[PDB]
C-alpha cells in the first residue's frame, strides 16, 4: 500500500509508462515532422481542385 | 521464584515481549504512515458525496 521497493502494481506501472509515453510521443512527433512538408499542404489544395 | 538467570517463565516472558512489542508497534505506526495521505481523507468526503 505504501509502495515498498518492488510493489508489483506500482513497479509495473512505472515500467509500462516508460514505454507507453516514449513510443506514443515519438509517433505523434515524427508523424508531425513527416506531415510538415509544404507540398503535402498543396496536395490538400490539389484535392480541392480535383474534386471541383 | 527470585528469578535466577534462565528461570523458564521469566526468561520466556522477556523473549516474547521483545517480538510482541516490536511487531505490534511497527504495524500500528506503519499503518498510520500509510493512512497519513490527504487524498485518503478526501476519499472519506468522496464517500459522503457518493452516499448522499
From Swiss-Prot, chains A, B:
Keyword Cell membrane attached: yes
Superkingdom as given in the UniProt entry: Bacteria
Cellular compartments per GO CC: plasma membrane
GO MF terms, alphabetically ordered: lipid binding
Localization in the cell: Cell inner membrane
Keywords per UniProt: Cell inner membrane, Cell membrane, Lipid-binding, Membrane
Domain notes: A helical hairpin is formed by residues 25-137 which is conserved in all known ESCRT-III proteins. Helix 5N-5C (residues 193-217) contacts the helical hairpin 3 subunits away and is essential for oligomerization. The C-terminal flexible linker and alpha-helix 6 (residues 220-256) are not required for oligomerization and do not resolve in electron microscopy.
Family to which this protein belongs: Belongs to the PspA/Vipp/IM30 family.
Subunit and partners: Polymerizes to form rings, filaments and ribbons. Rings are formed by stacked rungs that tilt to give a dome-shaped curvature. Rings form with symmetries ranging from C11 (55 subunits) to C17 (119 subunits).
Protein's job: A membrane remodeling protein capable of forming rings and/or filaments on membranes, which then curve and tubulate the bilayer. Rings will form on liposomes, altering their positive curvature so the lipid bilayer is remodeled into a negative curve as the membrane enters the ring. Ring stacks of varying lengths can be seen joining isolated liposomes. A lipid monolayer can be drawn into the center of the rings. Required for thylakoid formation.
Protein name from the UniProt record: Membrane-associated protein Vipp1
Organism: Nostoc punctiforme (strain ATCC 29133 / PCC 73102)
Species lineage: Bacteria, Bacillati, Cyanobacteriota, Cyanophyceae, Nostocales
Gene name linked to the record: vipp1
Span covered, complete protein: 156 to 207 of 258
